[PDB]
């Protein structure tokens, strides 16, 4: 198994992140649904950034939406790919910052909101295997993502 040195997190922290993410990926649509519904319930203003979704008014409607299901898979597969770079994600963040800062106008604050939604859902679905250690390593990985993408927003002309 070829060693791939990561940045900022320790090797053991990266392994806790990628072990949990493998569980996410095995049911990506289900995790995606849960995370976006939690985001949209805790922070209803985020729903307005998704044109195909902004009309959905209840949890039953959100769970029935094929569009929300597709958005959830979009979000979690892009984030998983970034996490698997173990901090070597400069190239990946460039187009994501470009679309999110320039077209969608996503404030960095919403990335913090979805980070909270991700930790909440991971606790809810893996209550036996998402402990203090795994939670801390995931918080560090998402913090690094938010820090680096905030820096890319400013390189592309936007504060966010
Ligand atoms: Cl743990």
16: CA distance to ligand 1 center in Å?
Answer: 7
71: CA distance to ligand 1 center in Å?
Answer: 28
Per the domain annotation, does 95 fall within a domain? yes
115: CA distance to ligand 1 center in Å?
Answer: 18
133: CA distance to ligand 1 center in Å?
Answer: 4
State the total domains in the chain.
Answer: 1
Per the domain annotation, does 60 fall within a domain? yes
Domain hosting residue 96, numbered range: 11-155
| 111 vs 106: CA distance, rounded Å | 8
CA separation, residue 68 to residues 18, 30, 81, 104, 112 (Å): 25, 11, 20, 17, 20
Find, among 37, 60, 34, the residue nearest to 50 by Cα.
37
Block residue for tokens 């060693």: 3
| Method underlying the structure | X-ray
Per the domain annotation, does 145 fall within a domain? yes
Per the domain annotation, does 160 fall within a domain? no
Q: Could you please report the per-residue DSSP string of 1-31?
A: ------SSS-HHHHHHHHHHHHHHHHTHHHH
CA separation, residue 157 to residues 3, 13, 97 (Å): 36, 33, 10
Per the domain annotation, does 107 fall within a domain? yes
For residue 98, give the DSSP letter: I
CATH number at residue 105: 1.10.490.10
Find, among 25, 20, 22, 61, the residue nearest to 40 by Cα.
61
Q: What is the resolution of this structure in A?
A: 1.9
Per the domain annotation, does 1 fall within a domain? no
């Amino acid at each position: 198994n070829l060693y791939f040195q990561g940045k900022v997190l320790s090797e053991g922290e990266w392994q806790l992140v990628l072990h949990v993410w493998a569980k996410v990926e095995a049911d990506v649509a289900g995790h995606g649904q849960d995370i976006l519904i939690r985001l949209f319930k805790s922070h209803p203003e985020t729903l307005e950034k998704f044109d195909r979704l902004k009309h959905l008014k209840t949890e039953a409607e959100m769970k029935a939406s094929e569009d929300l299901k597709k958005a959830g898979v979009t979000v979690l597969t892009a984030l998983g790919a970034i996490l698997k770079k173990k901090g070597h994600h400069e190239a990946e963040l460039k187009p994501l910052a470009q679309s999110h800062a320039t077209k969608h106008k996503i404030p960095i604050k919403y990335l913090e909101f979805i980070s909270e939604a991700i930790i909440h859902v991971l606790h809810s679905r893996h209550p036996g295997n998402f402990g203090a250690d795994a939670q801390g390593a995931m918080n560090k990985a998402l913090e690094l993502f938010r820090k680096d993408i905030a820096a890319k927003y400013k390189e592309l002309g936007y504060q966010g």
